[PDB]
């Protein structure tokens, strides 16, 4: 299923690119292909680690569906993020 990794990463790149161009004020500073590649893998893997934790936390609470308390637990040590992510 390495084919799925490529299909999903292509999707991810769309938003990643949007954000790269965003806080760039639309094209001003360069990025290497390595940097784009690294950022994408980093985004993709972190989302995977978090999802896996979200699922474990939901299951720990005996639920089949991930809810807000799971995300809040994941973000327990970052009170600023907890707020930002809800605002």
């Amino acid at each position: 299923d390495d084919e799925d990794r490529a299909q999903l990463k292509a999707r991810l790149w769309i938003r990643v690119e949007e954000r790269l161009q965003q806080v760039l004020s639309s094209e001003d500073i360069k990025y290497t292909p390595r940097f784009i590649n690294s950022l994408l893998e980093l985004a993709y893997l972190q989302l995977g680690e978090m999802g896996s934790d979200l699922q474990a936390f939901a299951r720990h609470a005996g639920r089949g569906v991930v809810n807000k308390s799971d995300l809040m637990l994941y973000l327990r040590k970052q009170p600023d993020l907890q707020e930002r992510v809800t605002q």
Binding site: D4, L8, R11, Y44, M50, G51, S52
Partner: peptide
Amino acid sequence: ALIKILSQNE
């Protein structure tokens, strides 16, 4: 996409 990416490991 998001749900599929979050679900990558299981």
